[PDB]
Symmetry: C3
């Protein structure tokens, strides 16, 4: 697999793919901190390759004869199906456990033992669970690599990877760490519960980025995350009093941002009905709301959406969430290729 695509050859951070693969072989990806600077760039270049290969109907079968287990103990479309598609288009095979309760899969069996056994039959495991902590038990027990597909309200590392790829596409300076080229993002909605928000904000804070956090009170971004953002921006001297701002309305939170990152208000997590109805309707993105964005503003959403983005916005050239979803195929193909390829 040779990187010939028009991003890698123009890029100014050339890379040794062989060296990075060695380093990447058999790595678990649990949190976005498990992927460093060079790994990221390798993912991104390799992701463009696979995009190019697929867009040009060329042979995508660069990882043959692996068998993966896909374990989804909570509902998923994009994430589960796109992993599987990536697995199959690469020439490898997948076993699926898709069981809708953590309870009735650990049926008096410890997680430790389940992952001990299960890892013997496969080269790798993809693992979504509504528990934050189970993936950690799994990583220590497993003899094979785990890719976390979302652990409760913790993280979604491969979401953040495909999100970044999509951002980089429109705003390639995000990688340069150039103090005169700041990206501005607005994260809107369920900041407390959104594992995608969590992973993407920690990832972006390693680059030259300022953050608008647009939420109603009970879904404010967790303090531990702003401390992580704050620490990371300080590390590269991109921190100022303007780096992080909090808003409770759209009009203000959307000003001068390159990226609008919309999110779903997670009904499943609310107890007060009235509080849900109120929060549900707070931030609704519409062409009217977009009139005052920058012209180059791009709209992401990890999906699925309920009412938070009106369908009219799909026709606005600012909306890219369907492309974003598409990219998951390419990014997940790249991640798997890098980790699981033979020596």
């Amino acid at each position: 697999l040779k990187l010939d695509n028009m991003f890698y050859i123009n890029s100014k951070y050339k890379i040794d793919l062989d060296k990075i693969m060695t380093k990447m072989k058999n790595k678990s990806v649990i949190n976005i901190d498990d992927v460093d600077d060079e790994e990221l760039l390798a993912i991104l270049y390799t992701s463009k390759q696979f995009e190019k290969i697929l867009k040009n109907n060329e042979d995508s079968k660069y990882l043959e004869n692996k068998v993966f287990c896909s374990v989804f103990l909570e509902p998923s479309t994009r994430t589960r199906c796109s992993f599987d598609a990536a697995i199959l288009k690469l020439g490898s095979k997948v076993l699926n456990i898709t069981d809708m309760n953590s309870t009735s899969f650990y049926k008096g069996e410890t997680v430790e033992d389940a992952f001990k056994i299960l890892s013997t039959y496969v080269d790798g495991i993809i693992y979504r669970d509504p528990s934050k902590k189970n993936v950690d038990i799994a990583v220590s027990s497993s003899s094979k690599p785990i890719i976390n597909a979302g652990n409760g309200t913790g993280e979604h590392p491969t979401q953040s990877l495909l999100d970044f790829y999509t951002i980089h596409n429109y705003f390639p300076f995000i990688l340069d760490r150039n103090i005169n080229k700041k990206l501005n993002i607005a994260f809107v909605g369920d900041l407390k519960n959104g594992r995608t928000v969590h992973s993407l904000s920690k990832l972006l804070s390693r680059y030259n980025v300022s953050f608008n956090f647009v939420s109603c009170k009970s879904l404010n971004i967790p303090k531990d995350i702003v401390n992580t953002i704050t620490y990371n921006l300080k590390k590269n001297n991109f921190y100022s009093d303007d780096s992080i701002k909090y808003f409770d309305n759209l009009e203000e939170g959307l000003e001068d941002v390159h990226i609008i990152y919309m999110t779903r208000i997670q009904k499943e997590r609310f107890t007060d009905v009235d509080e849900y109805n109120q929060y549900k309707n707070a931030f609704i993105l519409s062409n009217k709301t977009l009139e005052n964005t920058r012209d180059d503003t791009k709209i992401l959403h990890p999906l699925p959406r309920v009412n938070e983005i009106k369908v009219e916005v799909d026709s606005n050239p600012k909306s890219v969430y369907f492309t974003q979803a598409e990219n998951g195929l390419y990014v997940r193909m790249a991640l798997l290729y890098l980790i699981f390829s033979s020596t």
Copy 2:
């Protein structure tokens, strides 16, 4: 790589067609209603299915559609159609991703059909979709950037069922295709003619040929008017309509007379088929049933050589392999 129909020369001279070019033109078609299939597409479907049936039976290589990936979305529970389609995919040498219910999916959280299909389309080359909704399938088709085959919906279209039904009938009575005023097929549909979509849709398909229909039911479970009209219409279009064309009965002994085909329906009991009931039918008579059958056909009948309902079910495989090959193969 490229599927060759045996005896292409004879089939092109008999029907007055070019089967190679019909087949080429089916690339990327979606098949949602039986009316999506014209006269020439049906021949191609039928002969491409025979070919796969020849192949599999002489243990030959059937891998004519390698390296495709399909998503199979089944939001009803099913057994035979779901399995049948996955077997067809796998025997063609392609791969399949399965959804077998709403709850394991982002539908659970309220995602729309439009969104879910816009996205699924980008991961795969095509989609097989079953959904007890009336209109989700049509939404899926405008949302989808890839061809879809409808595996069964709430408007009662189930077109691969009516294609395999047709293929079974044609097997034993090939003259069905010929539209020859001297060779009329007669068929008795029997049972829940009111609810059986499978009857409605095969009715609609058969009525494009020289056929006549005996409908056998209670007054309660009569055949719908809309469907008679379409039968009547379609028969008049090739001059096969006469006052004989559509008889109506309320017992087997009368209904089963002089039919080539008996098509039993699931009731969803004056109509229970037995060896005795069958003594007075024609000798060439074949009995179909889309399946499953509770007790509308007694197990004794399975032994009778007039029974072909298990062969009918087996034919779903060849028909679905044919349809996947025709819609999705490269050039």
Copy 3:
């Protein structure tokens, strides 16, 4: 065409033609462990060992390509279900999965026209036997209501033979001693493994609470099989209350699960749940060569510390299910 290491050594040692045995296995359904005869067992065991060697050298395992299997599990399973599927994928074949008011007969009659074979788990006694007579294709029983689960007994035996190959020789001088421990009344893998082991020169220690004693029917079949090969003595079967006597001079300790579902209420369960707990302390008495098996899953009956003990092989045992299921699919379905 799979080649077996030492094929000809083995033929002259057991007075068999392996090739002819392997060939004759084409289209055999495997429902009950009594459907596997002496020669079929040898064939499965050495065929499993070849797939073990082949997978451990990252060699080509694709000895059964272009078959399509249906997998029908009408009760929850993960270890058994996945293992079969992995076995299939790694042989280069494909599977359709059912994980979940038509007759069984009709369902299997149709289903077997689409597929080359079928793997079926059903807690009904009846359905699997119905399926076998209705199906046009071979079936592998993955577990049914009659306590039959033959690939579990095959993998259990394969595991024991790995450490004590003499188990196959029927050498009056080389006897294997096994302790089965825990719920002997309900532990259906014990019943089945007991019957199979009793065809060879083996001694049995049954270690249980009174009410969970081995059933007299199993003792009987054991006694019968042992007497048939002239391996039976009043010492062939011993009964124990406790583990320290229990575990003396056994090559194998086979721990069973204590199944909460099989007791009236949680109070009765609790009577038995902790009665036998294997620790490193309880393992001090055992022979140096003692290996510990457990069909899994476990709860408290083997303390986690025992996993690090080199005597524990229950995880290698679970892993062996892959090599055995591969072997069995190979022998039944290949040309």
